[PDB]
Design a binder for this molecule. Structure first.
Ligand SMILES: NC(=O)c1ccc[n+]([C@@H]2O[C@H](COP(=O)([O-])OP(=O)(O)OC[C@H]3O[C@@H](n4cnc5c(N)ncnc54)[C@H](OP(=O)(O)O)[C@@H]3O)[C@@H](O)[C@H]2O)c1
Ligand SMILES: Nc1nc(=O)c2nc(CNc3ccc(C(=O)N[C@@H](CCC(=O)O)C(=O)O)cc3)cnc2[nH]1
Ligand SMILES: [Mn+2]
Ligand SMILES: [Mn+2]
Ligand SMILES: [Mn+2]
Length: 159
């Protein structure tokens, strides 16, 4: 099973200048809980944005060019990325925009954080078709002293 996990600001913005400009510790904690002990697939730009391997997860990087760091696994196609995960229950695709586009048709589950923040960005989450997806979990949180925007955790499963 393939799942996508992402945090979206208004208008599906996910990034600007290879960064995420907001800071929502509660959402990073949600990301860690839902990815720990699973393989994570990311594109090369997202690998450069994170800047280090994510501990406790098999890190698989898509790039058309040879890898430059043996602490992670480098693959050259979507099919190779999936195969490199082995026989696991759930593969987590962690972006970015181009990678989400390619895996969305293959995904059964979406873990989405909707952030009430207006962000100029240059990268968006794919338009998906709402009729294809059932919301099975949602949890709203107001802003607090640690998290400066309100946010909604949602899990959707392909119908
Ligand atoms: N809010 C969120 O949840 C979230 C999550 C993740 C990322 N982001 C943001 O998203 C932005 C990065 O997204 P992006 O769309 O620019 O880049 P990306 O999807 O992270 O990476 C694209 C790169 O991945 C490689 N790639 C993708 N598909 C491939 C394929 N089928 N075969 C081989 N290589 C492939 C290519 O690398 P080569 O050029 O080396 O071939 C391509 O240039 C950043 O702003 C980041 O902060 C946000
Ligand atoms: N919901 C969501 N939020 C995100 O921030 C997110 N980020 C990415 C890609 N970028 C990043 C950037 C940093 C870390 C990171 O530092 N993670 C630590 C945080 C642990 C914690 O804060 O409790 C980790 O171990 O996962 C992860 C992914 C992909 N999907 C996402 N999905
Ligand atoms: Mn092929
Ligand atoms: Mn197999
Ligand atoms: Mn806000």
């Amino acid at each position: 099973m393939i799942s996508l996990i992402a945090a979206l600001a208004v208008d599906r913005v996910i990034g600007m200048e290879n960064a995420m400009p907001w800071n929502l510790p509660a959402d990073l904690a949600w990301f860690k809980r839902n990815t720990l002990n699973k393989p994570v697939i990311m594109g090369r730009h997202t690998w450069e944005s994170i800047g280090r391997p994510l501990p406790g997860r098999k890190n698989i990087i898509l790039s058309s060019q040879p890898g430059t760091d043996d602490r992670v696994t480098w693959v050259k196609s979507v099919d190779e990325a999936i195969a490199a995960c082995g026989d696991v229950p759930e593969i987590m695709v962690i972006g970015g925009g181009r990678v989400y586009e390619q895996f969305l048709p293959k995904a059964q589950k979406l873990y989405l954080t909707h952030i009430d923040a207006e962000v100029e960005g240059d990268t968006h989450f794919p338009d998906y078709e709402p009729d294809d997806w059932e919301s099975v979990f949602s949890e709203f949180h107001d802003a607090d002293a640690q998290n400066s925007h309100s946010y909604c955790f949602e899990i959707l499963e392909r119908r």
